[PDB]
């Protein structure tokens with residue numbers, strides 16, 4: 001029953017987006033990808049040229065019943081998100097309605113901080129952009145989950161597995177996260193949800 | 196100047212394919228994606244439903260002068276590769292002309308073994324498919340580079356970074372592989388090609 005709205009824009013980071021989508025599907029989460037292209041185009045060219053088809057334009061699915069909204073990074077993709085009134089309103093509405101906001105890489109500093117969506121809360125993002133996250137909020141962790149504000153953040157292409165697994169934990173739980181992790185041949189430095 | 200031909204078929208594993216493409220581009224390698232087993236259609240639905248647009252049909256690019264041919268996994272995609280005469284012949288021709296064959300996940304066992312492409316090569320692949328690789332050829336390692344036959348293999352979605360980085364090391368050098376690795380925020384456990 002859990003569901004995720006994964007946003008995509010021209011210049012989104014394709015490893016971040018695709019890894020996350022794949023993991024969520026493996027976790028039994030229904031995924032809808034939403035284009036935030038300004039014209040509604042669904043055929044998105046990502047930051048390294050990968051061409052990815054979104055399922056729907058954001059305006060058609062933003063009001064949907066999703067448990068989490070996911071913001072991939074990629075500098076130009078994140079700038080598109082920042083500059084989209086609809087995207088920002090949608091993020092705010094997920095937060096205000098008690099749902100989860102998940103953002104990786106460039107997205108925290110580029111989207112969340114300028115719009116002051118989370119004035120209180122811990123967050124991370126891509127490390128070269130750490131001076132764009134307020135110092136009292138920054139943590140240098142692969143994933144940061146601040147349950148007080150239901151904000152999940154993560155750092156870069158290489159933390160996309162950690163990020164996706166944490167979304168699975170938050171939507172479906174530890175058993176499913178561990179199950180998905182066990183499928184991947186993941187590196188020892190990524191938490192695998194069993195103790 | 197280095198270039199790569201990344202093959203895509205219905206059911207290819209999208210994290211494996213996309214992570215590899217992204218890393219290669221970050222390494223300064225020109226990447227062409229080719230659809231296989233689709234009668235020329237460029238829209239490829241991957242194993243978890245991610246839809247990619249390939250650059251060209253394989254038949255149109257198979258005789259390009261790429262330095263490496265990359266075979267993503269995903270069991271259905273790898274079966275399409277196995278069952279495509281053009282794919283198999285292209286892989287053989289890359290090898291005979293002194294170029295690299297790179298295969299991940301289901302691709303070694305599904306494509307390389309049944310066609311006896313590398314009959315005494317050493318190789319890895321997805322662990323649950325160990326029984327599909329002749330016992331004397333199997334290594335259980337995140338990445339295997341058999342320099343004698345120019346065969347690069349790797350294990351799963353979670354080894355796609357390791358796989359892509361070794362391609363960069365081989366085609367454009369260790370310093371570039373480290374530069375790319377340093378961009379990613381990689382997990383502990385993955386080799387970063389530093390000094």
Ligand SMILES: [Mg+2]
Pocket residue numbers: 119134
């Ligand atoms: Mg503040």
Ligand SMILES: [Mg+2]
Pocket residue numbers: 314329
């Ligand atoms: Mg044999």
